[PDB]
């Protein structure tokens, strides 16, 4: 048994304003309005003009994959619309946009604790796909929508992103999304610093061989940045699972004289 998304009906969506182009289509900021449920916020994303069959199934199947899905750190399907002509995906509307861009803009701006809690909700959002035996292979702070909460939630359903056994030997698990999200956690302590600067992706894959992690961010909590070196632990087996990371953030927002030492 798998879920599926609900049909909305096209009178229930005003599209408000583009807000992103791409290869795939648009993205667009709107409201959603069923008959006696509050209006919500959403974002609509379109397939490009013209598309193909083929492109109206593939681009409908990331909907059947996010509708399987029910996690607050997961981005949530409201519902799809495909008995109307341009078919569309409907999904909550993130205020804050790109974790990666929204740290960019706001470079210095949160504490500690909050950015701790960015990196806990990612993880537990990783931990449920993870549980799910689902692999994402594409994590990364551009992948990571945040709401006026500053809630985060994995979207998006690269080589200084990825493990070096993904890079090698094409083995995508979910210990090399581990590895991943050691860069993200790297990523938000930097306030969306480039991995590894101005390397080349051959210098990062060389560096990385010969033993070579990245060095604390700026003020970066030792502790997190320790974990950071358990998720790029060289065998993929020696890394932490994500139930793990969790479990070790969870222990230091609790004990939260652990991020003093820097």
């Given at each position: 048994v798998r879920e599926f998304a609900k049909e909305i009906d096209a009178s229930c969506i005003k599209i408000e304003k583009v807000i992103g182009v791409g290869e795939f289509g648009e993205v667009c900021s709107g409201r959603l309005k069923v008959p006696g449920k509050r209006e919500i916020c959403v974002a609509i994303k379109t397939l490009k003009a013209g598309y193909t069959d083929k492109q109206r199934r593939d681009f409908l199947s990331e909907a059947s994959i996010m509708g399987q899905f029910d996690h607050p750190n997961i981005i949530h399907l409201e519902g799809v619309v495909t008995?109307?002509?341009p078919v569309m995906i409907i999904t909550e509307y993130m205020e804050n946009g790109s974790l990666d861009a929204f740290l960019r803009k706001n470079?210095?701006?949160?504490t500690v604790i909050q950015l701790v809690g960015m990196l806990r909700g990612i993880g537990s959002g990783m931990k449920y796909l993870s549980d799910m035996?689902?692999?994402?292979?594409?994590?990364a702070a551009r992948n990571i929508l945040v709401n006026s909460n500053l809630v985060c939630k994995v979207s998006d359903f690269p080589?200084?992103?990825?493990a070096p056994e993904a890079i090698?030997?094409?083995?995508?698990?979910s210990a090399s999304d581990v590895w991943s999200y050691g860069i993200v956690m790297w990523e938000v302590m930097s306030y969306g610093e480039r991995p590894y600067?101005?390397?080349?992706n051959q210098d990062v894959i060389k560096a990385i061989e010969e033993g070579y992690r990245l060095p604390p961010?700026?003020?970066?909590p030792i502790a997190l940045h320790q974990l950071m070196l358990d998720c790029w632990?060289?065998?993929?087996?020696?890394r932490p699972k994500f139930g793990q990371i969790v479990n070790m953030l969870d222990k230091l927002i609790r004990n939260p004289n652990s991020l003093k030492r820097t």
């Open positions: 008995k109307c002509k470079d210095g701006r949160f035996s689902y692999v994402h292979r594409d994590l080589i200084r992103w990825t090698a030997y094409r083995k995508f698990t600067w101005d390397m080349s961010p700026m003020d970066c632990q060289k065998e993929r087996s020696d």
